[PDB]
């Protein structure tokens, strides 16, 4: 079932038999991270490491004690020793709580992994905070997105993604604390 | 013909889908932060197939507003 | 890269390409060679052109 014993370590001594001997081995993306999945530990009680990422930003890499994630089944929350989870997220608000303070980022969709060591790895594309969203032009395009209904199924999918994004964005600009 | 989510059955990949939801979030940002999000929205590259080894046709992308919503 | 006053950067990974494209070559693997950057199509064709697309 695993007849290809791959890995960064095994690639080294095989590459020393086909390449010229003048070149050092290429690096791998495993050599640039110490935080693994099955590496046991990484919780110490109540606050767990939350690596909330972005292609253009690292929005938080310190620890929080509960993260409210907007999954496609619905909003869920992650405690310290949560079950391992690969959660696809809807457009919704990722809420980071470490205690009494709470930051709310509205994300565009993108997965969030809970690894067996308890590290949460939220991975979205556009994660704007709710301070820099406008409540005016969202319905100006949502009422436009609730109008253009073509038979083209490619644009029908993009209009469906246009509807549910502004529908969850308006629902999370009405009920703010 | 595909079996999966609503973007996948409609031929669209997840990369174009999640960038569409990233494109449409940037259109409703506040203007002190909407124009700086237009920098990370622009697509400027070009591509060319190589079927024989040296010859190929061309394709040019010069978009400044995001990934195309219509079919590629 | 696109511009070429880099100093052997676009050639060092060109030799590291075929060092990788011969180690993982083990059973007759179909390979599509892709170059990002205008200095890649001028140097990968010299090394491996028939599986370049």
From TrEMBL, chain A:
Transmembrane segments: none annotated. One of its GO terms (cellular component) is mitochondrial inner membrane. Residues 50-120 form the ATP synthase F1 complex delta/epsilon subunit N-terminal domain. One of its GO terms (molecular function) is proton-transporting ATP synthase activity, rotational mechanism. It is found in: Mitochondrion inner membrane. Coiled coil: none annotated. This is Mitochondrial ATP synthase subunit delta. Belongs to the ATPase epsilon chain family. It comes from Polytomella sp. Pringsheim 198.80. Pfam families: ATP-synt_DE_N. It comes from the Eukaryota. Keywords: Hydrogen ion transport, Ion transport, Membrane, Mitochondrion, Mitochondrion inner membrane, Transit peptide, Transport.
Automatic annotation (TrEMBL), chain C:
It is found in: Mitochondrion inner membrane. Transmembrane segments: none annotated. Belongs to the ATPase gamma chain family. This is F-ATPase gamma subunit. The chain holds residues 107 to 159 of 317 of the full protein.
């Amino acid at each position: 079932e695993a007849a290809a014993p791959a890995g960064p370590k095994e690639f080294t001594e095989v590459w020393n038999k086909k390449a010229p001997s003048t070149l050092i081995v290429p690096e791998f993306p495993s050599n640039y991270t110490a935080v693994k999945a099955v590496g046991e530990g990484q919780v110490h009680g109540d606050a767990f490491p939350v690596n909330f990422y972005t292609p253009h930003s690292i929005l938080s890499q310190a620890q929080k004690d509960t993260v409210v994630l907007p999954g496609v089944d619905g909003y869920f929350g992650v405690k310290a020793s949560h079950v391992p989870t690969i959660a696809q997220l809807k457009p919704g608000v990722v809420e980071l709580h470490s205690g009494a303070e709470s930051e709310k980022f509205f994300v565009s969709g993108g997965f969030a992994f809970v690894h067996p060591n308890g590290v949460t790895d939220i991975c979205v594309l556009e994660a704007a905070t709710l301070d820099q969203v406008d409540p005016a032009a969202v319905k100006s395009a949502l009422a436009a997105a609730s109008a253009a209904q073509p038979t083209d199924e490619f644009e029908q999918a993009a209009n469906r993604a246009a509807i549910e994004l502004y529908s969850a964005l308006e629902s999370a600009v009405e009920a703010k604390a | 013909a595909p079996s999966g989510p609503f973007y996948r059955v409609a031929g669209m990949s997840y990369l174009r889908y999640s960038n569409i939801c990233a494109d449409l979030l940037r259109n409703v940002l506040k203007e002190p932060f909407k124009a700086k999000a237009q920098a990370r929205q622009a697509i400027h590259f070009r591509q060319a197939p190589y079927v024989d080894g040296k010859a190929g046709a061309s394709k040019v992308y010069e978009l400044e507003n995001g990934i195309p919503k219509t079919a590629n | 890269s696109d511009k070429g006053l880099c100093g052997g950067l676009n050639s060092n990974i060109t030799k590291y390409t075929r060092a990788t494209l011969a180690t993982t070559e083990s059973e007759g693997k179909d390979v599509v060679v892709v170059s990002i950057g205008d200095k890649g199509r001028s140097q990968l064709t010299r090394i491996e052109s028939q599986r370049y697309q």
